[PDB]
Structures are given as structure tokens and as C-alpha cells.
Amino acid sequence: DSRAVPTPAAWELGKKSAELLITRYTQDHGEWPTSFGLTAWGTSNMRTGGDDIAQALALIGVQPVWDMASRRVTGYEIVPPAKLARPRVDVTLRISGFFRDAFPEQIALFDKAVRAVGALDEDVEDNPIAARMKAEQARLVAGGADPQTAERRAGYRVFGSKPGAYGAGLQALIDENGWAGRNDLAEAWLVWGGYAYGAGEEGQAERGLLEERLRSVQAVVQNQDNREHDLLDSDDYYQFEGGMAATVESLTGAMPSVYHNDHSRPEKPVIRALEEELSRVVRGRAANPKWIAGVMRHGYKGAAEIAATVDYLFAFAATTGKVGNHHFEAVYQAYIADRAVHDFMAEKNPAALAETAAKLNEAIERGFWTPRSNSARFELENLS
Template sequence: MHIDGYLCEIKDVQIRDGLHILGGGPEAEPRVNLVLAVLRASQVWGGQANALPGLRAALAAHFGLVEKELLGEPGAPVKVPAELSDLVEGPSRSAADAIDLLEQLCRRAAEGMEERGWDVAAVPALVREVLGSELPDAVAVLEFACREVVPRLARTTDEIDHILRALNGGYVPAGPSGSPTRGLVNVLPTGRNFYSVDPKAIPSRLSWEVGQSLADSLIQRYLQDTGEYPKSVGLTVWGTSAMRTQGDDIAEILALLGCRPVWDDASRRVTGFEVVPLDELGRPRIDVTVRISGFFRDAFPHVVGLIDDAVRAVAELDEPVDLNYVRKHADEDTAEHGDRRRATARVFGSKPGAYGAGLLPLIDARNWRSDADLAEVYAVWGGYAYGRGLDGRAARGDMETAFKRIAVAAKNVDTREHDLVDADDYFQYHGGMVAMVRHLTGASPEAYVGDSAVPDQVKTRTLGEETHRVFRARVVNPRWMAAMRRHGYKGAFEMAATVDYLFGYDATAGVVDDWMYEKLSAEYVFDAENRDFMKKSNPWALRGITERLLEAAERGLWAEPDAQTLERLRATYLELEGDLEGDDQ
């Protein structure tokens, strides 16, 4: 990608403006920002997908542009219509420039509605004022914001009332779950007793479309990187993601295997699957090994059965093994030990009743030396097979056999409301898979991140690309750091946690470059404003950040640190240790 396009893509990334305060609804500029984030996606409304276009997509269409094409190749030269460039000042040479101009128009419209109190009657006149012409789609989207989005955000105050009602043994109104930035406005307002999806309706028809796109995007990226098809893909699957997306990950697994779900039209439930013929599929069937979370195991046992059934069905197809990698691998394992059931086990997780991947305590306690230690814990925690008749059977050997074949270790992100270094689970599950494969084979697999935050604009990036993207867009973004400073102790804690999770991903997958450690030192430790903030609000967070950076250097993850930087970090750590010890006495 051209550097201009890359920078504009980073600029277009949505990040959080601070932390949520219970019962506090957004007002003024924060409300404008949140409404714009919600309106960027096409809306699922009244049971209909794409009931309304995204606001930016509607504006793009008005000017003869296609938002999806602009985002697909942001560095490409584009002839920006004069009608657009006359309305908004700024460069107008590339697709990224066009996106920037459109985003400015969206913001101008949202700010205009904020000034008018989100009065629905004011929308048509505002659209004419902003665009200089009629635009029915933009009017419809902004009227939707006035009638649905803004009133639902205003009811964030319900959170405290409903918590108090629950503590008093009263009734808390129910509501659906999901991500409002994926077009699911009906999940608002928050503070309701949310219910999940119908487990037997996973994957939904909409998620099947997204899952196919994820599978195709992953395969195309691997072909681009290596020139061949991946023979086996390792995928991490969580229950929370399945609830938000209604099964994007499951749909991707079926698509990679060359299967498609079958639904009952009346109930919309999944009744089974059918195998896609090879001539229709147009590529080999990809073997898939799945590491599920404990929550997914508990919430979706029948989906585990569906995946298992699909794997076993594909393994028995009378097809050439060079076009059916599932059969190829199952035949090889059956020849080795004679147990076909073991040879088709592809779903692994924690033992029944256990949760997690086990790596966080190891990383936190600094109780590891090499990939062997990380892989040992990952295998001990995750070496249990699930499927028909398995139900958590100890199967470490079968897990390791499957992992040795993994060419791609993948994790999907379905929302921009959080990212890879917002929680430890990402590096524990995804990074742990990379470390496990590296230990077993001596080489790291390709590590990919599937991005379906905008369901109709799916992308696959390498883990390194996604880490760099998150680092530049959020981690060292002055706006994000300023937002954290508003939250005192908790804000400093979030900054320290971000450093910990970056370190964890580097320890497991090797994705943090030296310049990133230097930048963390400069922004989180040496920057006067951030340093003074943490020393005052949470000196333990600052000490933890400093200690973690020094550990990265000691372990060689930070391969060639600047000597002066290290000296300043050591001096800062000793100073903080002395201050905190003095406070304890």
C-alpha cells in the first residue's frame, strides 16, 4: 500500500474516547463522535440487513463514488468530483483523500444536527445546506439518528436505575446484545438485561456472507504471501464474538472446509450443512483446527457438534487428497494409530469446567524462559478434544499433531470498540497458538487477523500489520492518552495494561519492533505530562510499565535498545521503587 493510503487508513481508524462512566450518556462533541461511529455502518433494522446505508456510503454514492472501493485501495489515484472538492477543503488526488473529504462532510452534518438539538424536522434543510442539493439517503440516515440513535444514547442513564432495581429484586427490562457500531442500534440503550442469540440459529444467513468473505480473504492473502493454498488453518473462536456476530467465525470454518449451512426458513435455525462440490468450490478444502474458549464450549455445544460433523463428513469424501486436505491429514493419522475418531478431532479447548489459555499467570510471574515453556502451558490448558462422543477427552497428542500442520494461525476481530491489546485473551489464545506451532515445528506460522468490523468490507492483515495499526492509531495516539488522563487511577491502569498485553503478544508471536518499545518509553515514561499524571494518579502503573520495558530488553524481545533509553528507564524504576517504599513506611 502507498504510504499516503496507509496514513489515511490509520487516520480513519475509530478509537475509544476514554472509558465509560456508569449512567453517563454522551453529550456535545462526544455524542457527535459516537453518532458518527454508529452511522458509519449500514443499519440492520426491522429484521432487514442493509435497511439503511452508512452515512458516508450514502454521501459517496451521491458523488458517484463507491465507499467500499475507496477503502479497498486507499492509495489509488481517484478523480474526485468537483462537486465534492468544492464543498470541502483538502487534497483530492487519491481514494484516501476522497474518504477524508466525505468524512468531513459527515461530521459537518452531525455537528449541524447537534446544534439543532437533533430535531428530525430540521434534517432536510440541513442536508441541503451541507450538500447544496437534495439527498434522500442522507436524509433517511440522519432522520434515523434523530428518531432512534440519539434517544437511545440519551437513555444510558437507565443503567444506574436498572442496577438499583436489580439489587432490590425488581424486574430489569430485557434487550438484545451485539455491537452498535456494526449497525445493531437495537442493542441500545445499555443497562438492560441483555439476551444473546438463539444458539441454534448460528451461523445466521448474514454471518454466512461475512464468514465466506473472511475465508476468501484469508486464502487470498495466503496465496499472495506464499503462492499456494494453506493446507491447515488454526482459528481461535470465542463465545462473546459468536454472540455479537451470530457466528462469523463458525461460518468461516464451514467455508474453509467447503461446506455451507442449511437453515429452516420458518425458524431461521440451522438444521445442518451441505457439502459444496469441488467444481463449485474452485479450490482445495482447507483443514481447520479450532481452539475454543471455555465460554464458547458451554454456550454453544451444538455448534461444536456442527463443526465436528462437517470435519468428519469432509474427511470421508471420495476426493483426491491434493484437493481435500482434511481427508489427506485424517488418512495419514489413521495410518499411524488406526483410530479414525482421533484422526478427525479438530476442536480443542480447556478441560471441562476450566477456562482460559493459562499464559497470563506465566507472563505476569515472569516464570518462563522459552517457547517450550509457553507451549507446555498452552498444551496443558488446551489439550482436550470436543465433538460427538468426545466431550473434553484428554487429547494433547492429537492436538499437537493437528497444530504441527497449521500454516496460518488466525483470529478475527469483529468490532472497533476494542482491539488486540485491550485484553490478555488475544495474546493468550492467538499468540499462544503461534508459540505452540513455532515450538512444534521450529518455524512460526503465518499469523493473520481477519477484520470484519465493517461486515461488507472484510480485510485480512498479518498480525504484525494489525499490531502496528493499533499501535499507531490508539496506543501512542495523543488523543487516546489524553482521554486516559481524564480517568485518573483507572486511566493509568489501562495504559499499563496496554503495555503488558503488547509485551505478551511479543513474547508469544514476536510482533513488537524495537521502535515501538522506544516509542512506548518516550510517550509513557519520559513524556512529562504522562509521567506526572501517572506519578500522581497511579505510580504503581508507571512502575509496572517501566519494569515491563526493562524486562523486554533483558529477554531480548527489545533486541537493540538505545543505551541512554535503558539507563533512563533504570533510573526511573529505582526512583519509583524508592518513592513507593517510602510511602509504605
């Protein structure tokens, strides 16, 4: 039932997640955060009863109100600063197409709650949201806007692909490998996802506002609720979170922090930097000999999984630069320079092996991977 989202359980999860995330930000940077960017998918919030909406609401310092008997959400309440041991944090929400289609009432609740917070009389130190909204509202009025329209424009925090469309709109570009820099991905990303959603707003084109929001962002955030997929067995994670982060860098010239958080255990959510999660997946899956044993008893599908992994590794390197040499080395050593695994791929899927050795040579060229010795570089183009 959509009417009951976010749930009490999802709000506990998202309230705890938000605090661990601010703690972690303060530990990495030595100051309070003022602006996060969040990604929000449909099936994820169905499975958790609205973890991401919850989190975004706790970050801005607002809480759902439920009917005590039916447990439908009937509205929101502002957490007052009396109840806040940390500052409100500004949130910009990149929503997927399916999330747009499945959770419009929750988009409407988020949109309202954030405009409400944006209209309080709090100090800048405590409320960056209000300070941004009023200042940008001022600026649009200076240049000659109707105050009503300034309010609307300065107050959008929800952004996605246009009505009837889906995805991150990078797939054309990235697969063909026709980009000069991050700027090309960021351009395409902004184009596709630059549509605003509000209480009574149905997907206006506002690419300018999205740029203004992404310039403020200090950290990109994504929550994963299950251990069934991982950020390296699908293209979706790098497109959404890697895309956003690439865009902030194109706009600001500095790569924001990225945090890829674990909500698979709702009682204990773990915050991790993207670098840390990539590492966990390489140790626990990609380069895990038990996992590699497994996919060598699946022939074609199995060697596809291998090639795919290096693809998404490659794609994270290009969007965020948060893949190290160690990682590329690990997949080369475990996939190509293990003749057991090489031979398995040559036999059972010669395409996947050429794809693989192509993406590894592109990694050397583009500077993602400086190999252990030049022996490596010869063999890889050789094999292609």
C-alpha cells in the same frame, strides 16, 4: 436463539472472510494453504450470529442448511469441488470455555462436517483434510487400534480447556514471569487446552492429537467483531492467538503466520497480519496523542490503561515475536520520555509507572527492543 446459528448474515461474512484469507495467504507465501488454526469465543459468535463457525465451515468447503421458514439450522451440505475455485483448507479449532458451554450443537455440526469432508475421495492437492485423516487413521491401525477408535482420534478438529474449566491457563505463569523460553508457555498452553470435543464427545484428554494438529498449522487466525476492545487492552488475545502461535513454533521450530482479521463491518471484512494490527492500534490508540490526552483526564484508571498496554505489547513480543523495535520505541517516547506523561503517572499512579518501566527494561534484556541510545536503558532501571 442458538438453533439459528450460524445465520445467513454470518455465513455471508464468513464465506467472504475465508476467501480474502486464502487470497492473503497466497499473496504472502506464494502457495495454497492446507492447515489453519482458529480461535473461537462465545460472546463474539452471539453478537455476529456465528462468524467464526461460518468461516471455519467455508474454509473446509461445507455450508449450513436452514429451514426456509424458521431459519433454524437443520444440518450441512458439502460444497462439491465443481463449486470450488480453490482447495479445501484444513481447520483446527481452539474454543473457549464459554464457547463450549454456549454452542455445543455448533461444535457437533462442525465435527460431523469435517469428518464428512475427511471421508471424500478427492485428490491430495484438493483435499488435505481427507489426506491427513486417512493417513493418521492408517497409522493408528498399523500400531494396533480398533478402526472405529482410529476414525474418532484421527478426526478431531475441536479442542479446548477441560469440562468445567475456562481460559488459556497461562495466567499463573506469565504474570509472575517464570518462564525460560516459549517452550514453557507452549507446554502450559498444550496442557490446559488439549481436550477434544466431538458430536458425542464431551471433552476427552487428547494432548497428543492436539500436538499433531498444531504441527500441520501454517497460519493462526483470529476474528474480532467490534472496535470497543483491541488486542492491546486485554490479556485474552495474546493468550489465545499468541499462545497458539507460540505452540506451533515450539512444535515445528518455525513461527506460523498470524492473521488478526476485522469483522466489525460485516459487508467488508478486512484480513490483516498481526504485525499490521498491532501497528494500527499503536497509531490509532496506544500512541495516539488524542487518546493519551483522554486518559490523562481519568487519573488512576487512565494510567492503569497505559501500563496495561505495555504489558500486552510485551506479552505479544514473547509469544509471537511479531512486535518490532519501532513499537516499543513508540510507547517509550510517548509515555516515559514525554515528561508531561511521565509526571502524570508519577503523581496519579506511581505503581503503574514502575510496572511500565519494568516491562520496558525486560524488553531490552530479552531482545524485543534495541533502544535509540543507551541513555534509554539507564533511565528505565533508574526509575525503577
